[PDB]
Design an enzyme around this catalytic site. Structure first.
Site, PDB file in Angstrom:
ATOM      1  N   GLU A  33       0.648  -1.395   0.142  1.00 21.66           N
ATOM      2  CA  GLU A  33      -0.059  -0.057   0.146  1.00 21.66           C
ATOM      3  C   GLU A  33       1.009   1.318   0.028  1.00 21.66           C
ATOM      4  O   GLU A  33       0.605   2.043  -0.821  1.00 21.66           O
ATOM      5  CB  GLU A  33      -0.988   0.030   1.173  1.00 21.66           C
ATOM      6  CG  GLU A  33      -2.129  -0.859   0.962  1.00 21.66           C
ATOM      7  CD  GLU A  33      -2.968  -0.676   0.141  1.00 21.66           C
ATOM      8  OE1 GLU A  33      -3.834  -1.541  -0.276  1.00 21.66           O
ATOM      9  OE2 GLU A  33      -3.169   0.380  -0.488  1.00 21.66           O
ATOM     10  N   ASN A  89      -7.592   9.111  -6.168  1.00 24.28           N
ATOM     11  CA  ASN A  89      -8.497   8.129  -6.942  1.00 24.28           C
ATOM     12  C   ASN A  89      -9.398   8.942  -7.964  1.00 24.28           C
ATOM     13  O   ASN A  89      -9.487  10.045  -7.826  1.00 24.28           O
ATOM     14  CB  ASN A  89      -9.462   7.365  -6.056  1.00 24.28           C
ATOM     15  CG  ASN A  89      -8.481   6.776  -5.069  1.00 24.28           C
ATOM     16  OD1 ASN A  89      -7.842   5.966  -5.027  1.00 24.28           O
ATOM     17  ND2 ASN A  89      -8.794   6.988  -3.419  1.00 24.28           N
ATOM     18  N   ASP A 100     -12.471   8.991  -8.541  1.00 31.32           N
ATOM     19  CA  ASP A 100     -13.636   9.394  -8.093  1.00 31.32           C
ATOM     20  C   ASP A 100     -13.811  10.768  -7.194  1.00 31.32           C
ATOM     21  O   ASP A 100     -14.786  11.179  -6.720  1.00 31.32           O
ATOM     22  CB  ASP A 100     -14.432   8.239  -7.457  1.00 31.32           C
ATOM     23  CG  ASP A 100     -13.802   8.061  -5.815  1.00 31.32           C
ATOM     24  OD1 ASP A 100     -12.557   8.674  -5.237  1.00 31.32           O
ATOM     25  OD2 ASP A 100     -14.325   7.333  -4.762  1.00 31.32           O
ATOM     26  N   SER A 106     -11.656  10.890  -4.657  1.00 30.00           N
ATOM     27  CA  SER A 106     -11.261  10.567  -3.132  1.00 30.00           C
ATOM     28  C   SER A 106      -9.516  10.512  -3.114  1.00 30.00           C
ATOM     29  O   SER A 106      -9.120  10.470  -4.318  1.00 30.00           O
ATOM     30  CB  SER A 106     -11.755   9.549  -2.309  1.00 30.00           C
ATOM     31  OG  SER A 106     -11.415   8.183  -3.145  1.00 30.00           O
ATOM     32  N   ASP A 122      -6.349   8.262  -0.906  1.00 33.11           N
ATOM     33  CA  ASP A 122      -5.925   7.223  -0.091  1.00 33.11           C
ATOM     34  C   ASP A 122      -4.637   7.920   0.738  1.00 33.11           C
ATOM     35  O   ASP A 122      -3.925   8.668   0.460  1.00 33.11           O
ATOM     36  CB  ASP A 122      -5.501   5.904  -0.905  1.00 33.11           C
ATOM     37  CG  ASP A 122      -6.626   5.351  -1.394  1.00 33.11           C
ATOM     38  OD1 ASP A 122      -7.964   5.563  -1.087  1.00 33.11           O
ATOM     39  OD2 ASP A 122      -6.417   4.815  -2.650  1.00 33.11           O
ATOM     40  N   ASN A 166      -9.002   5.245   2.697  1.00 32.99           N
ATOM     41  CA  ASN A 166      -9.643   6.103   1.566  1.00 32.99           C
ATOM     42  C   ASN A 166     -10.583   7.399   2.259  1.00 32.99           C
ATOM     43  O   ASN A 166     -11.299   6.942   3.036  1.00 32.99           O
ATOM     44  CB  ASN A 166     -10.498   5.245   0.660  1.00 32.99           C
ATOM     45  CG  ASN A 166     -11.166   5.797  -0.594  1.00 32.99           C
ATOM     46  OD1 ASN A 166     -11.252   6.956  -0.644  1.00 32.99           O
ATOM     47  ND2 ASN A 166     -11.363   4.917  -1.453  1.00 32.99           N
TER      48      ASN A 166
END
Ligand SMILES: O=S(=O)(O)c1cc2c(O)c(c1)Cc1cc(S(=O)(=O)O)cc(c1O)Cc1cc(S(=O)(=O)O)cc(c1O)Cc1cc(S(=O)(=O)O)cc(c1O)C2
Ligand SMILES: O=S(=O)(O)c1cc2c(O)c(c1)Cc1cc(S(=O)(=O)O)cc(c1O)Cc1cc(S(=O)(=O)O)cc(c1O)Cc1cc(S(=O)(=O)O)cc(c1O)C2
Length: 129
Positions: A35, A46, A48, A50, A52, A59
């Site tokens: 990660e 991301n 959309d 968002s 992380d 998220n």
């Protein structure tokens, strides 16, 4: 800050992650590696809207609040910048909540592609424990 392997395993154990909801400690170490590469400051956007955040790439669509993910929830009830801190407490506590809710660890894409069903114990072998 960048953890070493054994230093991260150790901190994860002290936070009670070892066998939490059935997942042995190497799992959480493995997931941290793929990660964030053990980096508490890791962030990734991301498509959309968002982002992380942190060592466990938690998220903002669902789990925390960064004030710029429109219509997102904040199910851990925590600012995302707390997920960026050198002390992993918030990340751990948010990770517990995600797993216990829950989709287990399958929620973490890199964990699902590189860790699930492999020798996760290699990630803890040779560390002080
Ligand atoms: O990386 S190591 O596991 O080798 C390590 C061992 C000790 C250490 O003191 C440190 C690292 C430095 C250190 C690191 C961190 S962290 O990397 O951010 O996790 C935190 C601390 C710290 O001293 C502060 C601290 C936190 C906690 S916790 O509330 O449980 O997370 C416990 C302790 C702390 O010093 C006590 C402690 C426990 C342990 S043990 O692993 O439980 O035996 C080893 C050492 C300790 O100082 C002795
Ligand atoms: O995420 S968990 O580790 O908690 C989990 C454990 C089991 C599960 O059945 C599932 C999740 C659900 C699940 C998820 C997925 S995935 O999200 O697409 O990766 C896939 C499956 C699945 O049951 C199907 C499946 C795939 C594989 S694989 O060949 O390794 O990819 C093995 C199995 C599957 O059911 C068997 C299996 C292995 C394992 S093991 O952890 O690898 O020993 C746990 C569980 C299993 O059902 C028991």
């Amino acid at each position: 800050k960048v953890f070493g392997r054994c230093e991260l395993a150790a901190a994860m154990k002290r936070h009670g992650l070892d066998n939490y909801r059935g997942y042995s400690l190497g799992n959480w170490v493995c997931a941290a590696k793929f990660e964030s590469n053990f980096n508490t400051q890791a962030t990734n956007r991301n498509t959309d809207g968002s982002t992380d955040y942190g060592i466990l790439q938690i998220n903002s669509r669902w789990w925390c609040n960064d004030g710029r993910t429109p219509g997102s929830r904040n199910l851990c009830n925590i600012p995302c910048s707390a997920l960026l801190s050198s002390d992993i407490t918030a990340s751990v506590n948010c990770a517990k909540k995600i797993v216990s809710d829950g989709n287990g660890m399958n929620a973490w894409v890199a964990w699902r592609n590189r860790c699930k069903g492999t020798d996760v114990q290699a990630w803890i072998r040779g560390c002080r424990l």
